[PDB]
């Protein structure tokens, strides 16, 4: 049966996809998202040596980088834009992050807060939020600067990433950071999950965050010499010697499956089971086990009730190391073989071949390639393969290495199954197996808009105005997207409101206030009774309702759609102003 997680929304921020529909596009082009250290970052001529080992020296130079880490929209959140420049970089990403992930939900705050309370105990949580990280680097340069300067507090508590999300949520739920290392991300939805069957909480936010702020870390992967010479993960490769660090934000909203398919939720796939354990004492501290790696892998199986043999297609963890690859694997074909001797019937690769080792961020980010394949039943390459690492014997298993594009067919009405892992370091091992989902037309809808600022509304309605002209729109989605607008974002200050029954209509109406132009009629702009006016939309006459709301008048839009309720759909998140915010604001040269 499963412990039937659904996953109802979801934000991912990754190298070469500041969302994740740029992210698939990026997955199915095969694209290799990987470039060298951006000068903004810091000097780093004065750590890059070729030579391996060199003391004060690192022989790597590449990533996988987000674009403008330290921009912020601190007053969004109701932070001082002074606390903003000495804030954790990861901390500001994840609550960016996490209001998207909402958006992509169709949830408001206090929408979702009384979702997740009428399904849990009384004083049980409504929200939950599991964060996973595991570097604090942004405090290194307080210190740096405390030392030859005036002394400068930089915090580095990475219970912030997590409890200043419950707090901008107004969440109620557990409230956990977890560093598990590479395997953090999974790890939070473990406990989330865990959380969400127990009853702790309503529903539940999990995700994780990694940043390469400092360049301390690559100092570390030189002398270690984890670092590979380059800078590629070569997944089940040849010649892949180490790894190349990546950056990336992402989440998930969590809820048990008959609560969301209750509340109408969009459903992106179900979590049937997850697993977590750790490799014992193997021959070194950072030396992965094979077994250990197996008996996770089983264990999420017998939790999900699933036929491993059924499973379509697993998301590795795949870095790319000389002894890690081929252990991988071993784990993998250990797994299996408890179950089937069947070999090439699924598919492996990894995401790390596109944007690098996320770390601690590296689950979600794989969780989101795995849900994307399924949403569009596509498999995507896997880079830097094309000869398959010697050690690995790929025709005596179970999978078959990814390389080409090629089309992902749902067998019957039977749900696409997927496996996805992700091995600490430290030891910390994880796997999470998931599932796809199987389940007034004409008339004048009244599409609402809203923003913090006038200059963020009319960004609001261009950014909308692009994705409505996408060849998936038509006029027949207009309910579902007046819908979703309506109960599935904050009403804020700057407010705009249309009334309209076709799709090419709206568009011109968002252009209009896009471009500051002249606004159509039953159209009503503001840069910032109800029960007679919602009666009166109700009947097919809204205007009065949409020009009220667009003043100022707070309006409980569900009163609307009490036949069977429109569907929420994914429309573009907030545009965050795009400030920047650094420790070195306001400090002396
Ligand atoms: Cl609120």
């Known amino acids: 049966q499963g412990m039937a997680i659904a996953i109802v929304g979801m934000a991912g921020r990754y190298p070469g996809a500041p ?10 082009a095969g694209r290799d998202s990987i470039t ?3 000068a903004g970052r810091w000097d780093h001529s004065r750590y890059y040596d070729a030579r391996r080992g060199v003391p004060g020296r690192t022989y790597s130079k590449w990533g996988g980088f987000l ?8 007053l969004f959140f109701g932070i001082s834009p002074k606390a903003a420049s000495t804030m954790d970089p990861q901390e500001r990403l994840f609550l960016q992050c996490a209001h998207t992930t909402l958006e992509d939900a169709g949830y408001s705050r206090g929408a979702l807060r009384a979702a997740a309370r009428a399904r849990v105990a009384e004083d049980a949580g409504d929200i939950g939020v599991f964060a996973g990280a595991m570097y604090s680097e942004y405090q290194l340069y307080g210190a740096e600067y405390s030392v030859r300067g005036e002394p400068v507090v930089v915090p580095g508590s990475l ?29 939070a939805i473990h406990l989330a999950c865990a959380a969400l069957q127990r009853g702790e909480c309503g529903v539940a936010l999990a995700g994780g965050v990694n940043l390469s702020v400092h360049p301390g870390k690559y100092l570390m992967i030189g002398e270690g010499q984890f670092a590979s010479s380059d800078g ?3 997944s089940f490769g040849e010649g892949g010697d180490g790894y190349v660090p990546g950056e990336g934000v992402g989440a998930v909203l969590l809820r048990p499956l008959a609560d969301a398919v209750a509340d ?6 179900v979590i049937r089971g997850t697993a977590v354990n750790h490799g014992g004492h193997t021959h070194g501290f950072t030396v992965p086990n094979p077994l250990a790696q197996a008996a996770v892998i089983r264990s999420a199986w017998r939790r999900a009730g699933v036929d491993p043999r059924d499973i379509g297609c697993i998301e590795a963890h795949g870095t790319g190391t000389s002894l890690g690859d081929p252990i991988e694997i071993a784990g993998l074909n250990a797994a299996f073989a408890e179950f089937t001797d069947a070999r090439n019937f699924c598919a492996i690769g990894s995401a790390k071949s596109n944007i690098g080792h996320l770390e601690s961020a590296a689950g979600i980010a794989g969780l989101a390639k795995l849900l994307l394949q399924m949403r569009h039943g596509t498999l995507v390459p896997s880079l830097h393969a094309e000869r398959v690492n010697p050690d690995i014997d790929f025709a005596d298993s179970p999978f078959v290495l990814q390389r080409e594009a090629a089309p992902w067919p749902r067998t019957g009405t039977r749900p696409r199954l997927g496996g996805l892992s992700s091995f600490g370091a430290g030891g910390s091992n994880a796997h999470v197996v998931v599932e796809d989902y199987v389940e007034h037309r ?16 009319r960004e609001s309605a261009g950014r909308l105005r692009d994705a409505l002209r996408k060849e998936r729109w038509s006029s027949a989605d207009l309910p579902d997207i007046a819908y979703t607008l309506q109960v599935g974002r904050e009403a804020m200050t700057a407010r705009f409101a249309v009334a309209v029954s076709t799709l090419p209509a709206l568009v011109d109406a968002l252009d209009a206030c896009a471009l500051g132009s002249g606004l159509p009629a039953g159209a009503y702009f503001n840069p ?34 009490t036949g069977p309720k429109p569907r929420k759909v994914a429309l573009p998140g907030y545009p965050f102003a795009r400030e920047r915010y650094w420790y070195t604001d306001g400090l002396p040269e």
């Open 19 to 28: 969302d994740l529909d740029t992210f698939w596009e990026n997955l199915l």
């Open 36 to 38: 060298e250290i951006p």
């Open 67 to 74: 674009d403008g880490i330290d921009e912020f929209d601190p």
């Open 159 to 187: 219970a912030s990433i997590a409890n200043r999300v419950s707090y901008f949520l107004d969440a109620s739920g557990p409230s956990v950071t977890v560093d598990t290392m590479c395997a953090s991300a999974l790890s």
């Open 232 to 234: 590629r993960c070569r």
């Open 264 to 269: 109408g939720d969009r459903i992106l796939g």
């Open 442 to 457: 004409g008339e004048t809808v009244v599409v609402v808009l809203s923003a913090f600022d006038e200059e963020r509304l």
């Open 528 to 561: 910032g009774f109800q029960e007679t006016a919602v009666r009166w939309a109700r009947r097919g006459k809204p205007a009065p309702l949409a020009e009220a709301w667009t003043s100022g008048l707070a309006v409980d839009w569900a009163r609307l759609h």
